[model samples]
Each structure stands twice: as C-alpha cells, then as structure tokens.
Target: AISIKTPEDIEKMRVAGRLAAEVLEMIEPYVKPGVSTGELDRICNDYIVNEQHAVSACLGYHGYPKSVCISINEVVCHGIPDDAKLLKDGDIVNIDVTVIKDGFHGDTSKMFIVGKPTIMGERLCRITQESLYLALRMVKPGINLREIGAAIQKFVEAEGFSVVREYCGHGIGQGFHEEPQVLHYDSRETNVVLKPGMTFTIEPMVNAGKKEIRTMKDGWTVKTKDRSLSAQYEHTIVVTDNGCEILTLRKDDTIPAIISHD
Candidate 1:
C-alpha cells in the first residue's frame, strides 16, 4: 500500500535531502581523474557525519559496508568503495548518496565524467538526467504509479536506450526504502495512486544495451550482464498540494544544461 506522509515528516525529509544535495555538490569539484572512489566516499562521509551531523544511510544498510555507493561505468548500483578502484580519464561514475537526519532519509545520485568522455558517454549522461525530469512532470495527485514508469520507458526507449528492470525506485521517508516500488518500464498492474504529502524517489537507470544484470561476488555491486555503459539520476521528492517539490535539487552549476526546455 502507498503511504502518505505528514507535513512534519516532509519537512524533516527536506532537511535531509538538502544536506544530501550539498554533500554531492561539495564533492563535485573533486570528481576528477586519479581520485579513488574510496576518496569520494570519505569526503561524503565526513560532510554528512561532521558537517551535517547526520548519518550515512548506505553504511550498514543491509550490510553495504561503505558510506556511499559509487558505481562506475557498467556497474548498476551498490558499488562498494575501494582504494583500488581509481577514477581514470574518460570514465563515468555514478555516486549514490543517502543521508539520515531527524529520523528521515534522503537519497539521490548523479553521474560524473572522470575527465573527458566520448560523445556517446555525454549523451547517455544527459538523457538519463532528463528522463527523470520527464517522469517528474507526470506526477500529480491521483496519477498512476505505472504512468511514472511508462513515461520513462517511452522516452528512454524512443531514444534507443534500455531501462534496468532489476532495480527500481522506491518510497522514501522514515525508512531508506519503503512501499510502492517505482519501476522504470511500463506495466499494467503497477497503478499506484499518488497522493498529496507522499514522498519518494524517481531514479531511472538507463543502460546502453540490454537490461540484464548480475551482482559481483561481493553480493552487493550490481552490473550489467552485457557490460554495457549505464547512467542514473535520482531525486527525493514530495507530492505537494498542487504538484511536487524536488527536495534533493542541486544548483545549476553542479549539473549544466545540455538540453534546454523550450
């Protein structure tokens, strides 16, 4: 069943979401080549724990061991941070950040180019980000949850990309993940109703190839079975009285506009 959050809950989540965005932005300038994913994780952990006085939601999250999930290239999600995993030129990494504050959780992620990337890489990043926004525009009170995934699937597939069916978005609030699993593909049975005050995440993982995925031996890091490139963007949002508010929104400087809305 879908849960509707209260005003107090939404406000608490806003605080966490804002902190999550700030931490991601704070680490953006350091997302260049030669920096290990572990280093990025350290930066995130320090900011969340020390600066924000919050807790790293990913750490000890079902035994996830790291403060952040840094998925590079074909890695879909849950990529543990390791010093051996160094960022190199032309590589794209997805840094998933989640923080817990005031007993509420905020989760979001953004893809970063380690250095210079190929033309296709840049396109993949841009399309993935826009896809989330397209889905967001469809969110309104009483809308179907299936419509969210349907819009995403339609746009991404129309652009010749595939969505990852294994991992879907989810409701966010007091818990890191809650009810109403948000899929990235169209489905007839996923008609969940959106209500005012409800909060959740809209993260669509678009792959450069087929949607097959597998986890590493570590039992956490999921990667595309075909080893194709992947990109993702996420935002914690609340179903407002009229529409919705993106609580985890970053500044324009963090993510520049590649495609404009006219």
Candidate 2:
C-alpha cells in the first residue's frame, strides 16, 4: 500500500510528528548513568499519554509491549526495556519513539550517550548520524529511493563501519509499518521513486563490527553477533515539491512549522 498523503493529511502528520519529537526531548534529561531503561520508560510513557495526549504507536501494536524502545550498545534495534539493564557511563543507547495523533503517525529515534562514551563509540554515533542526513538530502521527486540507501552504505563503509542488513527503516503513518521498505545499504533491491506526499522513515543503524546479528531470548532485543556497539537515528518525512519535509525533526521547534503544504 503506497499511500500518497494529501496536504490536509500531511498537516495532521505534522502535529503527530511534533509530539513525537517532544517525547524524545522530554526523556533526554532522564537518560544517564545508574538509571535503568525501565525508569526512563515510565517517564516517557506517562508524558506521551498525558501531556502529549497521543498514542504511543509502539505500545501494544502486535504485542510490541512497550511505550518506547531502549536499545543499548550492541543492540542494533528493538531492544525491549528491562529493569535489570542499567545505563553505564560508557554506554550508548537508542530511544525510538512514535506517536499517533488524529489518525496520523510520526516516528523518530536518537542516540543517548549515557556519559562521555569511548572515542570509538562517539565516532560511530557521529558517522551513523551523518550517514542519515546524507541520505535525507538526496530525497526529492524523481529520484530512485535506492540512492538514499546507497549513499548511506557508501559513507558508512568508507569509515569502516557496516550498515545493518536485517533491520531497515519503513513506511510509517496511520500504520506503524507500511510500504516501500527503506533500506540503509547499497543495493538494487528497490526502484521506488520519490514524489510529493509520500511519507516514510530513514533510520540507519550502523555497527562497529560485522552485520551479523542475533535475537535475545526476550524475542524483541536485536544485538550484533560480535557484541560490538551500534547506533541509529530516525526521522519521519513527507516528500515535498522542493525537498522532503522532516516531520519529526527537532531543531528548536520551528516557528510556524516547516511543512510547506499547498
């Protein structure tokens, strides 16, 4: 189902996206050493439900069983929050959030460095983030979506990192997962062309070691086979006439908003 959102529909997504971004901002202060991921999860769950008044798209969706995803080092993505998992000074974690408002959805995630991470960890986070933006800049009408993944793979590999193959970004909106699967690696797998009104997420998960991965006994945590660190960044976007509108972008909360719907 490749749905093209209308301008009015896009406006609703903007609201949902803003709320999702706010959830991330509200939780930043809570991510720190000695704090369990479960504790942070409680703060985030209450805020999203009460203050944001938006539904956490990850909660109870096909038995997801969480309000937010807190994946620590070596976990590529989808690491379920565990009370026993305490944040360490040198640990890196990813907080993935999605909120639904007025029947629209916004999904985004970011890295939370518990403290000053090791030099290599910081470098991995930096490059993975850069890889995501590099791909975002290439989003526009008429361009094959494959280019985004290819560019990400190019930059990440150039720096001696591997893009996760098992988990890629996806189309997010009214549904938690939708169509036109977004890959973060260089491949000839997709020919989907970008056009105005198409919405999706570009979350690139890069690893400090090989791409092989394994799932935890919990059935949700995905970790690197080699137990190396991992980092990921995500943003829901709507393709625009000029470029794509970053629906979940968090840069000081734009004045008058950033979407240019006509």
Candidate 3:
C-alpha cells in the first residue's frame, strides 16, 4: 500500500526538501568545466553534513559510496562520482541529490550543461524539464498515476526523444524509495489515484535517442545504449486538495513552488 503522510510528516519533509534544494543551488557555480565529479560530491556532502546538519541519503545507500549521483552526457542515471570523471566543455550533467533530516527524506535532481551547450544538449534538457512541469501541473486528487507518465511520454516522444523506462521516480518520505513506482511511460498497472497527503517524485529521464540503457560493472552507473545525450529533472511533491506543492523546489526555479488547481 502507498503510504500517506501526516501533516507533521509533511512539515518535516518540507524541511528536508528545502535543505536538499539548497545543496543543489549552492553547487551551481561549481558545476562548470575543470571540476571532477568527485570534487562536486565532496562539496555537496560537506554542505549537507556540516553546514545543514542533515544526512546524505545517497552515501552508503546499498553500499553506494557517493554523496550524490553525478551523471554526464550519455549516462542515464546513477552515475557514480569518480575523481577521473571531469566535466568538459559541451558536457551535460545531471546531479541527483537526496537528503534526510529529522528522519524524513527529500529527493531531487537537475540537469546542467558545462561551459557551453550544443543545440541537441540544450533542447533535450529543456524538453525533459518541460515534461516534468507538465506532470507537476497534473497532480491533484483523483488523478491516476498513470496519467502522469502518459503526459510525460507523449511530450517527450513528440519531440523526437525516448523515455528511459528502467529508472522511474518513486514515492519518498521517511524512506528513500517507497511504494507506488511512478513509471515514466504509459503503464496499465500503476493506476493508483492521487490523494491529499500522498507524496512522491515525478522524474522523467529523457534520451535523445533510443530508450535502452546498460548498467556498468560497478553495479550502479547506467548509460544510454545508443550513447546519445540524456537529461532529467525531478521534484518531490505532495498532493493537496486543490493541487500539489513542490517540496524540493529551489529558489532559482522557473516554476512556482506551489500550484492550486481550479
């Protein structure tokens, strides 16, 4: 069964979400070229641990040794940060961060283009974000979860890209991953209806080519089979009676943190 959050639980999640978002915002200036993914992980880990007094949910997660997942270019997701992996000009990277505070979890991710972005790179990132925004606006009581993927898949495919099906967003709260796997493609099984207090993440992994992916021998890194550019954007949200609130909304976000449906 999908867990429903209490008002108090939501409050704690909000705090955790804010801290996670702050980490992403704080690391923006350092995401450019000449930086190693390992360095970025250290910076974010320190900020979450020492400064915010929060916990890095990704570190030691299932023996995963990184504070954050930094995927660049063809990496679909879960790209382990390594000192040898340095950002280069015209590289698009996605940083996925999850922080735990007061025992609650907040998860989010965003795409960044190092130095300058190529035409395809920029468009893939933009479209992936737009797809996420579309799903965000559709969240409210009584809407089926499958509708979320329907909207995202349609928007992504219409733009000549494919949706990665292996990695889907998930329900998040006290647990990093909870019930109700939020698929990014049209699915017949996940027909659960949205309800007030139900929280989860809607992250779409859109690829510039085919949707196939392969996991590296490290047992974590996942890259596109076609070696095409990929981008993703994610937000942890809570369903409200009227609409939904973006729990991990960042200060520099283009969209409003909250939305009320008519």
Candidate 4:
C-alpha cells in the first residue's frame, strides 16, 4: 500500500531531494568522454558525504553496491559503475542518483551525451525526456496511475519507439522503492488514485527496439534484450491539491533545459 506522507515527512523528503539534485549537479561536468564511471561514482559519493552529509541510497539498495546507477548506451538501468565502463564519444549515459537525508529518500535520473552524439542518439534522449514531462503533465489528484503509463506508451510508440515493461516506477519517500508500482503501459484495475501528499517517481524507460530486457551477470545491470538503445528520465514528485511539485527538481545550473509547467 502507498503511504500518504505527513507534512513533517514531506519536509524531510524535500531536503533529501534537494541534496540529490545538488549531487547530480556536482557530477554533471564530469560526465564526458574518457571519464570512468567509477570516477563519477566517487565524485557523487564525496559530494553526498562531505558537502551534503547524506548517505548514498543505492550503495546498499538490495546489495546494489554503488553510490549511483551509471547506465551507458544499451544498458537500460541499474548499471554498476566500474573502471572498465569508461565512457566514449557518442555514448548516451543515464545517471540515476538517490540520496538519504534526515531519514528520507529522494531519487532522480537523467540522460547525458558523453561528447558529440549521433543524430539517433540525440533524438532518443530528447524523446525520452519529453515523454517524462508529458506524463508529468497528467499527474494530478483523482488521476489514475495506469493513465501515467498509458500516455507515455502512446506518445512513445506513436513515434515508433517501445516502452520497457520489465521495470516500472514506484512510490518513493521513506523507502527507496515503495508501493503503487507505476508501469510504462496501460493496465486495468491497477489504477492507483492520486491524492495530495502522495510521493512517487515517474521514470519511464523507452527503448529503440523491442520491450524485452535482460539482466547482466552482475545481477544489477539491466540491458535491452535486442541490444538496442534505451533512455530513461526520472523525478520524485508530490501530488498537491492544485497540481504537483517536483521534489527532486534540479536548479538551473544543474539542468538548464528543465522548465516547470507549474
């Protein structure tokens, strides 16, 4: 069951979300060609520890063993950061950051171009990000969780893209992953009614090919089954009486293109 957050819980989550956004901002400049993902991990870990006095949510998350999830190219999600996973030009990488502060959790993710990217890669990234925003526009009190995926799957598939169904978004606040699993496609009777103070993530993973996915030998890394490109964007959100607030929203310096419609 999804837990409705109290005012006090909401306040703590906001702080954690802010720190998570700041950590992502601190590491944005380093996500370029020739930089090892391990280095990026260290950068985030240091910022979260020394600057924010926070803990890495992903480090012990189900034995994830990483400060952040650094997925590159075909890797859909849960990519473990390692020295061998060095980024190169034209690679699209998804950096998922989660932080714990004041006993609350915040989670968010965004895609980045290592250097110059291929036209297809850029389109995929843009479409994925836009799809996320499009879905967010539909999130309000009285709306259904199924509609979230319905809108996303429709927009993405209309453009000849596919949505990954294996992994879905979830309630996020006190726990890193919680109830009311948000799917990327439509389903009946699973429509969770939205309400004020409800906090969750709307992360939809869109693929360039089939919807199938495979887990790597490491048991954490998830990749496209067809080896096609995949991109994802995520934000922790709070449903409000008027609309919604992006709890894990980054500042302009962190994400210059992000403009809140609210």
lDDT of each: 0.87, 0.86, 0.93, 0.87
- With candidate 3 superimposed using the best TM-score fit, by how many Å does residue 201's alpha carbon deviate from the native? 0.4
Candidate 4, residues 150-239: lDDT per residue as tens digits? Answer: 889999999888999889889988788998798888878576889989999988999998989998888888999999999999888888
Report, for all candidates in order, the number of backbone clashes: 0, 0, 0, 0
Per-residue lDDT, model 2, residue 232, is 96
Q: What is the TM-score of each candidate against the true structure?
A: 0.95, 0.95, 0.99, 0.95
For model 3, give the 10-residue run with minimal summed lDDT.
250-259
Clashing pairs in 4: none
Which tens-of-lDDT digit does each residue in 97-199 have in candidate 3? 9999999999999998899889999999999999999999898999999888988999999999999998899999989999889999998877888899999
User: Tens-digit lDDT track for model 1 on 157-191?
Assistant: 99998999988899989888998799989988687
Model 4 CA deviation exceeding 4 Å by range: 252-262
Q: Which candidate wins on TM-score?
A: 3
The best candidate by lDDT is 3
For residue 49, model 3's alpha carbon misses the true position, in angstroms, by 0.5
Predictions: Cα RMSD each: 3.1, 2.5, 0.7, 2.3
For candidate 2, the per-residue lDDT at 109 reads 94
